[PDB]
Amino acid sequence: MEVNQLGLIATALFVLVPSVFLIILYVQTESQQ
Amino acid sequence: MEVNQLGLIATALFVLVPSVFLIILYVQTESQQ
Amino acid sequence: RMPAFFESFPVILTDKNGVVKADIPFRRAESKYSFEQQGVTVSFYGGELNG
Amino acid sequence: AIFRFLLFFQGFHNWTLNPFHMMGVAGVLGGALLCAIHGATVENTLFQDGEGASTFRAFNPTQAEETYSMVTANRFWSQIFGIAFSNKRWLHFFMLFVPVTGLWMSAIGVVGLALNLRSYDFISQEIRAAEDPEFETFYTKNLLLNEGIRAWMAPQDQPHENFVFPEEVLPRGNAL
Amino acid sequence: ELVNVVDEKLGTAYGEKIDLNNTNIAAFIQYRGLYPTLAKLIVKNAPYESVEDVLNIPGLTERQKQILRENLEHFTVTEVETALVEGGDRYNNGLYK
Amino acid sequence: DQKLGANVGSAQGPTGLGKYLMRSPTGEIIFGGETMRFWDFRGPWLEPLRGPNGLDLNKIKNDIQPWQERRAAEYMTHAPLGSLNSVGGVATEINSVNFVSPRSWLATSHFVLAFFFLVGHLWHAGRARAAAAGFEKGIDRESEPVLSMPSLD
Amino acid sequence: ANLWERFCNWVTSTDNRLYVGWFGVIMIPTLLAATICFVIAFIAAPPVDIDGIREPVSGSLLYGNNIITGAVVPSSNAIGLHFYPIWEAASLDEWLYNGGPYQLIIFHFLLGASCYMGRQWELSYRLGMRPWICVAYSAPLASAFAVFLIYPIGQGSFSDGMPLGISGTFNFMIVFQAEHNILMHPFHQLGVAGVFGGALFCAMHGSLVTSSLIRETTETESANYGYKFGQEEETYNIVAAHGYFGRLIFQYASFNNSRSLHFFLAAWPVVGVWFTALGISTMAFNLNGFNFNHSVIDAKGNVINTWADIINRANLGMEVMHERNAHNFPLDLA
Amino acid sequence: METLKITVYIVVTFFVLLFVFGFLSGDPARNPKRKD
Amino acid sequence: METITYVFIFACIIALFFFAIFFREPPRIT
Amino acid sequence: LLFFFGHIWHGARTLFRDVFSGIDPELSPEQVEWGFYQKVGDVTTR
Amino acid sequence: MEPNPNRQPVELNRTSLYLGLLLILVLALLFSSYFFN
Amino acid sequence: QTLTYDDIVGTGLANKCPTLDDTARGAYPIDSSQTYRIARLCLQPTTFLVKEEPKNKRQEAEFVPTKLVTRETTSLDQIQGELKVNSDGSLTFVEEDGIDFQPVTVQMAGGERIPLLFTVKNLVASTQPNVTSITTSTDFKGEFNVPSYRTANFLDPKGRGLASGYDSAIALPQAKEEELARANVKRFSLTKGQISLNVAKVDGRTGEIAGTFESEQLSDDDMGAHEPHEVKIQGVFYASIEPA
Amino acid sequence: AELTPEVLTVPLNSEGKTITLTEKQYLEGKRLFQYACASCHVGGITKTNPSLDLRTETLALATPPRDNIEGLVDYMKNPTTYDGEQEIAEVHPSLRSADIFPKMRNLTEKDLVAIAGHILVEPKILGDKWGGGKVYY
Numbered sequence A, B: 001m002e003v004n005q006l007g008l009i010a011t012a013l014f015v016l017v018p019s020v021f022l023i024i025l026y027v028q029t030e031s032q033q
Numbered sequence C: 001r002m003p004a005f006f007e008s009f010p011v012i013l014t015d016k017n018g019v020v021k022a023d024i025p026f027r028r029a030e031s032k033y034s035f036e037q038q039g040v041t042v043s044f045y046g047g048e049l050n051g
Numbered sequence D: 001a002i003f004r005f006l007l008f009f010q011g012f013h014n015w016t017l018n019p020f021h022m023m024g025v026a027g028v029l030g031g032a033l034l035c036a037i038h039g040a041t042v043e044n045t046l047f048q049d050g051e052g053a054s055t056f057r058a059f060n061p062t063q064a065e066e067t068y069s070m071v072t073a074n075r076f077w078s079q080i081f082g083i084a085f086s087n088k089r090w091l092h093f094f095m096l097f098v099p100v101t102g103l104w105m106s107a108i109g110v111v112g113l114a115l116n117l118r119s120y121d122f123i124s125q126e127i128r129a130a131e132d133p134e135f136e137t138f139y140t141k142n143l144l145l146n147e148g149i150r151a152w153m154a155p156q157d158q159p160h161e162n163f164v165f166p167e168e169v170l171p172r173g174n175a176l
Numbered sequence E: 001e002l003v004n005v006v007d008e009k010l011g012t013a014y015g016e017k018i019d020l021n022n023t024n025i026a027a028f029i030q031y032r033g034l035y036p037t038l039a040k041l042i043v044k045n046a047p048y049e050s051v052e053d054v055l056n057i058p059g060l061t062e063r064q065k066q067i068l069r070e071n072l073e074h075f076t077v078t079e080v081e082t083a084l085v086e087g088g089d090r091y092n093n094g095l096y097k
Numbered sequence F: 001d002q003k004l005g006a007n008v009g010s011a012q013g014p015t016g017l018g019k020y021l022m023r024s025p026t027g028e029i030i031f032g033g034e035t036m037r038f039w040d041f042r043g044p045w046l047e048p049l050r051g052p053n054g055l056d057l058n059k060i061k062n063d064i065q066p067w068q069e070r071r072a073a074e075y076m077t078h079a080p081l082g083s084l085n086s087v088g089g090v091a092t093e094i095n096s097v098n099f100v101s102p103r104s105w106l107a108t109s110h111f112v113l114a115f116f117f118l119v120g121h122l123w124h125a126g127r128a129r130a131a132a133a134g135f136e137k138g139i140d141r142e143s144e145p146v147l148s149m150p151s152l153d
Numbered sequence G: 001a002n003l004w005e006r007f008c009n010w011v012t013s014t015d016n017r018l019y020v021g022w023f024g025v026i027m028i029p030t031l032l033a034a035t036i037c038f039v040i041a042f043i044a045a046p047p048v049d050i051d052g053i054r055e056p057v058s059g060s061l062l063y064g065n066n067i068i069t070g071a072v073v074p075s076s077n078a079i080g081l082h083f084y085p086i087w088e089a090a091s092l093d094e095w096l097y098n099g100g101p102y103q104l105i106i107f108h109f110l111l112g113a114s115c116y117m118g119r120q121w122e123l124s125y126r127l128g129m130r131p132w133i134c135v136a137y138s139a140p141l142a143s144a145f146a147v148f149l150i151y152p153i154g155q156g157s158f159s160d161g162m163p164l165g166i167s168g169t170f171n172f173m174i175v176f177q178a179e180h181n182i183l184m185h186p187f188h189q190l191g192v193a194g195v196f197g198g199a200l201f202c203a204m205h206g207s208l209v210t211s212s213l214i215r216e217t218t219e220t221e222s223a224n225y226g227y228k229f230g231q232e233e234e235t236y237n238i239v240a241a242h243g244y245f246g247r248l249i250f251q252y253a254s255f256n257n258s259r260s261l262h263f264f265l266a267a268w269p270v271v272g273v274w275f276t277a278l279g280i281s282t283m284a285f286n287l288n289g290f291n292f293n294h295s296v297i298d299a300k301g302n303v304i305n306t307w308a309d310i311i312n313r314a315n316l317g318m319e320v321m322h323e324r325n326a327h328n329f330p331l332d333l334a
Numbered sequence H: 001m002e003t004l005k006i007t008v009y010i011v012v013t014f015f016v017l018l019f020v021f022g023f024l025s026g027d028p029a030r031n032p033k034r035k036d
Numbered sequence I: 001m002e003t004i005t006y007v008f009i010f011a012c013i014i015a016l017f018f019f020a021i022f023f024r025e026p027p028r029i030t
Numbered sequence J: 001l002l003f004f005f006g007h008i009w010h011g012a013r014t015l016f017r018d019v020f021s022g023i024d025p026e027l028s029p030e031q032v033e034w035g036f037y038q039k040v041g042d043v044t045t046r
Numbered sequence K: 001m002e003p004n005p006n007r008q009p010v011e012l013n014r015t016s017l018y019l020g021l022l023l024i025l026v027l028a029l030l031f032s033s034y035f036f037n
Numbered sequence L: 001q002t003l004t005y006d007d008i009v010g011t012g013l014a015n016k017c018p019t020l021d022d023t024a025r026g027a028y029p030i031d032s033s034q035t036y037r038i039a040r041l042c043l044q045p046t047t048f049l050v051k052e053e054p055k056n057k058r059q060e061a062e063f064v065p066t067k068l069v070t071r072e073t074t075s076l077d078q079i080q081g082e083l084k085v086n087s088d089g090s091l092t093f094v095e096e097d098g099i100d101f102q103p104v105t106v107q108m109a110g111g112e113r114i115p116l117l118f119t120v121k122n123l124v125a126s127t128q129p130n131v132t133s134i135t136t137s138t139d140f141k142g143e144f145n146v147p148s149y150r151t152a153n154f155l156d157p158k159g160r161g162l163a164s165g166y167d168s169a170i171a172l173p174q175a176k177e178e179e180l181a182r183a184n185v186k187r188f189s190l191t192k193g194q195i196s197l198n199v200a201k202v203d204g205r206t207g208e209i210a211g212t213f214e215s216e217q218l219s220d221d222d223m224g225a226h227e228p229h230e231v232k233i234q235g236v237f238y239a240s241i242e243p244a
Numbered sequence M: 001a002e003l004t005p006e007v008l009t010v011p012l013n014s015e016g017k018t019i020t021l022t023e024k025q026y027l028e029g030k031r032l033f034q035y036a037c038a039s040c041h042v043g044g045i046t047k048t049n050p051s052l053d054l055r056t057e058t059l060a061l062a063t064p065p066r067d068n069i070e071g072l073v074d075y076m077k078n079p080t081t082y083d084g085e086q087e088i089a090e091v092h093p094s095l096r097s098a099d100i101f102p103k104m105r106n107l108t109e110k111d112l113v114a115i116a117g118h119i120l121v122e123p124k125i126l127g128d129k130w131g132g133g134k135v136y137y
Ligand code: CLA
Pocket: D005, D006, D007, D009, D010, D014, D015, D016, D021, D024, D025, D028, D029, D102, D103, D106, D107, D108, D109, D110, G173, G195, G196
């Protein structure tokens, strides 16, 4: 099907950007104490 | 120009994926002691 | 003319007072206003197809 | 009249397909889920603080102890569903966040509907369906129903337009 | 070059008279005395080469021939269209009220 | 339609299936349209037309008695459809025929009762187990069973 | 101890991470079979003939569907209510054409979901709890039985059951409106009052507790750390919330008993969903909503239209357009 | 098709026997408190 | 690309279920 | 419309700053009891 | 379960972050023209 | 002495044509001083072959064995028609009425579904000159008409049709219409086919005959949307004769 | 608008005579129409055969004419096809077949005039709604 050409990178960054934002916060938290 | 369509997401992930790998390791190091 | 509310709109032609006299029918088994039985023609004025 | 408002948004806006109403649906039904499951969990993890079979009176507002066991309720849901709450303050806040966030999203949805900025169509679906007469999905079947709603209720729902639709232009299926 | 054959036929006499070779049998109720006895005998003995040939149908009483003769002005003949005769659509074309 | 001269046995429908008569998935000749789902129906007004391979086409052309035409038209115009305020017909029909099928009352009224009684089973069965075990009024604080169990993780 | 009793002790063991139990013995294989067949069919099932008119409908992702349009399409109308397992078809191609996966999924799912409710009593009996949590779950379970089993029974075909898809669900809602006028039925209206009030009472109870949390924290940390798991004391002042919500309306319009309050929180949405579940079940036998079409006329006989007649024009639009080729006769009786 | 049918029939009957004999193997006794 | 995109997102959600259930933060009584 | 929520949120943060981390931990069923204080929350009127 | 004694902490100082970010940003600027092609 | 409806339901025999014993190999005399008629003609297909459309084309096409996906709904039965004796001694069967059509959908390798309208409408089959008796060596050859798979009132998923429906792509209001002309304008197909009726068993006492048949016709064209496939159907058949 | 005496005068026969119903004859006629007819003829159509409606234009061109009081009273006694060629009193309710259609057993000659009038007066009030179908609901 003739989909949007940027829907792939729009979805890839919709997942990757906020995911690694939360990963960065969790890993630095476990590394404290 | 008629460039490749996957070249955009190829460069974007090529930058992003190893970038966040180093960022996670750094922020979890400064949160130590 | 099509209102802004409608994604799709049928083709109906009225006259000077609004009486329906031509349309593009859906069911044709009992159609009374199709473009052939009414002999609907189109003419242009101005622009490219002028005349 | 509200029921007419519901059908008007389906025929003209395809409001069901809008992703903001879908989030609002999850807030209302998700809110009704938490309201039922939290009340049933409390009433079935109570402590025996009286001797009557109708346990409503074994509770004093003055009391300092919790009326039901948070530990037992946690183990029940951890083994039944996989996860479970373990903190009352986060639980009751979650019961505020879910229905409020749902309604806010639906409000954003129809703000765009004031400008007819609908979530009506999928372009990729329509383009090949226009050239493939054997491509049928549940999504194309709903748009035929909207084309029926619009053509059959418009002359009576919008009398100011003076809509006159002859019998031969009304979209209809077979026999019906 | 592709043309809707039923829309094209609406531009002929089929779109203003009762085509004895294509019109569904429910159209014979527009006039007096043609339904359902004569309407059945007409479609059964289709097609017809000219309008008057409907009077040579066997079994027509002399008064039957007369009632037709009073409705010849409302008849016509066009070449048979396959999309209008197949599926038995002259007896039930899928339209009701 | 047959009275008007239509050969119902060879009549082709818009979908390709027979307009009046088609076949069941096991070969039995049945009625066309949406009523293809109801080909398991058996009725006295209908059986005289059915043969070894289903509905007999030549019985259809010759053996339909006037009492069968009246019974079919009577049962057609008395379908088990109707509004709650007793307006017969489909939901889109206008007020006139005041009728609802007694089958519709008896079926719905006994499903509502059948459902709530299953809820009555679930209610009165779960409590009888708890009452016989001793914890129908709640957990005993001095002997909470979960506290004496190992952790899940 | 012999082997059979060792196995019985493991099944009903209160130490498993996930409780099995005797209801779980049936739930696990039925839910897995329905889950595995659904994920495969949602991705690569070929088009199936929903209405039995040799007009197949695409439903899987690999055949041109997205998440919003994809669905597992019900079984053919020529099947009706006949049992259609895999061994009744001459091949899996005929099985896939006639909507085989739909029957397999809903049957294993309904049987599995029923055992999920019985599994809720079972663990509550092993832990010393009160058993009526499964009664609350019966309302969404009865909702699944209505649109998957009861309504096909009343109409005579599984082709009119609710599809297993997002867009397919919207199709089930619109056609059900045109044929039963569900919006004008007092059972769906009670069901709307159950979910609206349920969301209302959920936000109300959540806001009032969070607003009367006693202080155990500073502002540089979350307030959730003030309560810790297993503590004996209550983490919020129940009296401060009553006098707050009492003065917002009047004193007696507010619950001072927490047990009576949490009972109300469970009774409103459950009893409301019970009715709308029976609303679908009773309309399966065509006892439809209130028909007020042409109910008001003037002194001469002219019809004075109301909002009910405007609804009737929208229903007629859905009526004449749904299943545009499956009808050869003027009445749609099922 | 038939040897699939025999398989499912044997698999279904197996779990049904586990379900019936399971609740009969003294289940009212399996509980926190009063085991009689 | 669309089908692979959808199946990938769905697979991650199922993968998140396994971690959130069996590798959860252990409930603890004080 | 989104900034309407910010006005009432940050607006409630300034007027209810004292109870931001919770309500006084030794409040008593007397400041809240009806028909007790003539004025709701005014200890100067018993 | 008793904890595993083979566990060690990982580090990456500030200078190693700049060197790594420089490597992949230059490798991207070099190879991007061949990705679009 | 024979089966009833309750002994056949669900068993699949309702789709089967009557057979004859192996000892039914006599002959049926045909007299020119009488008129005859087939009281019942039954055709039961057993093998559907579809000719695939190749590429280099200069290796002629072949017929593919395929599998059925529309179950036991494929037989033609209860067909009547006049059996006329000609001047050369040959017999011509002219079809009239009966269940002479069944829509059949068939799948080939790869998953492509080939719908078709298996039919013998308006069949006129004749024998070779002079046939004194219908024997086990007799065979028929005739032509029939193959109308459109869908009739005029049929609507596509977008609502377009021939005798009803839209006449454009209403979902693309401002798109060019010439690339979609083959999908907007429906055309009613009318083709012809052939069939041979090889008789193998004759009961000269009852007038019942039986044998094999092989017909060829085109598949569904979807109202002119695509090109049809050539289909070959094989199966058994049964028929009976009486004095008029 | 009111149910004026002028909307109650319908053709008596084919000779041009007129009959003026009362308010009670109208209300009585529509009450008995829903009793013995509306199961097939709701709104002026025919569920058993949508091709024949109860409009005054349709009854006028029937054989014999049925757009009056006499012909309709004659139709409820001996109903015929649209051309009068066949007496269809065996499949249509009538006093002559009151043995198979029990609803026709109690109708008096006065009741036949009240219903025949209601079938003529109602299209003078609803117009295209009478005998129009779902298109005009
Ligand atoms: C699964 C079913 C389902 C569910 C759960 C929802 C859920 C929702 N829909 Mg949707 N809907 C659905 C299916 C569904 N929808 C379908 C199939 C359609 C057809 C297309 C629609 C069409 C539709 C429309 C057209 C609209 C919704 C809206 C809404 C929202 C309602 C918000 C609300 O509470 O307003 C209720 C109103 C309020 C909360 C306002 C406050 C009113 C005050 C507080 C009441 C005070 C009363 C006072 C005491 C006096 C009373 C006296 C009186 C009783 C006498 C909610 C998110 C609406 C929306 O998105 O809103 C943004 C909307 O406009 N729906």
